[PDB]
Structures are given as structure tokens and as C-alpha cells.
């Protein structure tokens, strides 16, 4: 009547099983990374140049007010 029934793989077997190492490269050349670093450094230098010159002018103004008040 009944037939044999035990744990077996399904007909045709199972699907493929990945085992190879997969460490993909995100990707950015050393030249590009160094260029981005240098570019942001240059932008910061320019911004600080303008701001510190403005600060010098403000300090000179404050010094002038003090000089006017001294006598």
C-alpha cells in the first residue's frame, strides 16, 4: 500500500549555493581622494583669509574708538 517516505532532496536537486568570497571595491582613485582633500583645504584657506581680514578691520575700528575715548 504505502510507499517509502523519508527525507530526500526535491527532484532536480537544490539551487546553487554561493560560496566564493565577495568583497566588492567601492571605488575611488587615490588621485581623486587627494584632490578632494586639497580642494576642501584650499576652500577653507580662502574663507579664513577673507574672514580674518574682516576681523582685522573690525579690531582696528574698535581700537580707533578706544583712542578717541582715551583723553
Amino acid at each position: 500500500a504505502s510507499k517509502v517516505k523519508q527525507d530526500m532532496p526535491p527532484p532536480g536537486g537544490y539551487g546553487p549555493i554561493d560560496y566564493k568570497r565577495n568583497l566588492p571595491r567601492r571605488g575611488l582613485s587615490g588621485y581623486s581622494m587627494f584632490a578632494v582633500g586639497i580642494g576642501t583645504l584650499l576652500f577653507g584657506y580662502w574663507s579664513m583669509m577673507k574672514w580674518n581680514r574682516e576681523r582685522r578691520r573690525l579690531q582696528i575700528e574698535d581700537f580707533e574708538a578706544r583712542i578717541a575715548l582715551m583723553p
Binding site: 567601492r26 582613485s29 587615490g30 588621485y31 581622494m33
Partner: protein, 59 residues
């Protein structure tokens, strides 16, 4: 059949040397590891709520 695990030879052209120098000076692989840990924080934990939940058993 046998495999080699550590038998690679780094390229000595200017671009590859510059890439390795950028890795040394800008910590690219350290940021990559930080990135995996960050990604891994944003997924569901595997913890079950014992004793209100129980681990699977069998007959």
C-alpha cells in the same frame, strides 16, 4: 586540488602606489569597517523575549 590564500603581488605602477598611499593616509578600510558596523546596527536584533518567548525545540 589546492588553493593559494596569500599569493598576490601588489602592482608597482604609480597609480597603485598612490592608491595604497591614499589608503594609508586617509584610512579608507577603517571607514569601510565602520560602515559595515553602522549598516549592521540598522537591522532587526535576533533577541527573543524570554521567558515570554521560547527557543524552538523538537520532539
Amino acid at each position: 586540488t589546492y588553493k593559494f590564500v596569500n599569493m598576490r603581488e601588489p602592482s608597482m605602477d604609480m597609480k597603485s602606489v598612490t592608491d595604497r598611499a591614499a589608503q594609508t593616509l586617509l584610512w579608507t578600510e577603517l571607514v569601510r569597517g565602520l560602515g559595515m558596523t553602522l549598516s549592521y546596527l540598522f537591522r532587526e536584533p535576533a533577541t527573543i523575549n524570554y521567558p515570554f518567548e521560547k527557543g524552538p525545540l523538537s520532539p
